[PDB]
Amino acid sequence: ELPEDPRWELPRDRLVLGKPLGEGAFGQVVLAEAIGLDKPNRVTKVAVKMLKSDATEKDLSDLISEMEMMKMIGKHKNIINLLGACTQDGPLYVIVEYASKGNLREYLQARRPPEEQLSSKDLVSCAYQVARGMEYLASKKCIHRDLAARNVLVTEDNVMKIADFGLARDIHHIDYYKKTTNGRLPVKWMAPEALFDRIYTHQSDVWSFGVLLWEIFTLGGSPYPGVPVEELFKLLKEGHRMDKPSNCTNELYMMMRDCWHAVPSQRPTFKQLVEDLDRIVALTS
Ligand SMILES: Cn1cc(-c2cnc3cnn(S(=O)(=O)c4cnc5ccc(Cl)nn45)c3c2)cn1
């Protein structure tokens, strides 16, 4: 039913399927070992995405689109890269790079003081990598639409990788009240113009990066804790802006505030942010 693509196909018997990964939150995803991706007698830990049992024609369409998006966008150090696929004679498998330390929010929380604590340079370095991944995605004209620490994955070598940048999402079907599996409301990462007017741009992604920065320097803090949807609307209509996190230089809080500029055109680009974080890293102890 699915067209062959020898650029990416891997025979099913090269994939030893392992434990479920996301508890279901991010689609049907399992750890797996791939024999001879590159090198034919080496195994590589990878993550594999497939369709659930009760999956519609629309569900299959979506997974294909995401795979094809990964094909077009090309490779970068700081994004989750496509590695291969099994599309013939069985269920669609999309093989992607595996991030053994989980998402950036959990990785930060697991390293709060009362597992080793992260230095100031480590935290600014985390932000630089995430902005590098976003700079690359933007240069390829990709808009994430849901950039947050929960969608940054951390590899065994502490490499930050943006995840889920290729998902198919009908923005006019978002459940504003729907909560993450952690209990937070994704609307708290959306730029006002995206939330109120359904207008998604590279500039709204930069707003979301500002919130992500706030997550880094609170070591996994929760934005607007206790604030339900309707009151978030009020706070944004009134121009509310989160407070400076403790142990956060005034410079890095100005970056946050600059990302949260009321006027989208006045926010910095990811290209700008990368240049600035690069400089700030070189100057952090
Ligand atoms: C399609 N795709 C799947 C992975 C992938 C790679 N390595 C791991 C390790 N754990 N998990 S995870 O439990 O499912 C999880 C925890 N937080 C998140 C946020 C976003 C996503 Cl996609 N998954 N996730 C992984 C998922 C990359 N691309």
Residue numbers in the entry: 464 to 501, 504 to 579, 592 to 762
Any passages from the paper?
In the human genome, 22 fibroblast growth factors (FGFs) have been identified as ligands of FGFRs, and are usually classified into seven subfamilies, according to their biochemical function sequence similarity and evolutionary relationships. Upon binding with fibroblast growth factors, FGFRs induce dimerization and autophosphorylation on tyrosine residues, resulting in the activation of kinases downstream signaling, including MEK-ERK, PI3K-Akt, and PLCγ. Numerous evidences highlight that the activation of FGF/FGFR signaling plays a critical role in tumor progression and growth. Moreover, aberrant signaling of FGF/FGFR has been frequently found in various cancers, making FGFR a hot therapeutic target in anticancer drug development.
Previously, we described a series of 1-sulfonylpyrazolo[4,3-b]pyridines as potent and selective hepatocyte growth factor receptor (c-Met) inhibitors. Since the 1-sulfonylpyrazolo[4,3-b]pyridines as selective c-Met inhibitors have been reported, we are inquisitive about the binding mode of this chemotype as FGFR inhibitors. The P-loop of FGFR1 lowered down to form a pi–pi stacking interaction between residue Phe489 and the imidazo[1,2-b]pyridazine ring. Based off of the X-ray crystal structure of compound 8 bound with FGFR1, we found that it showed novel binding conformation, which significantly differed to c-Met ligand binding. Due to the novel binding interactions of compound 8, we thought it should be possible to selectively optimize the FGFR activity of this series of compounds. Compound 13 bound to FGFR1 with a very similar mode to how compound 8 bound, by using the nitrogen atom in the pyrazine ring to form an essential hydrogen bond with the FGFR1 hinge and using imidazole stacking with the residue Phe489.
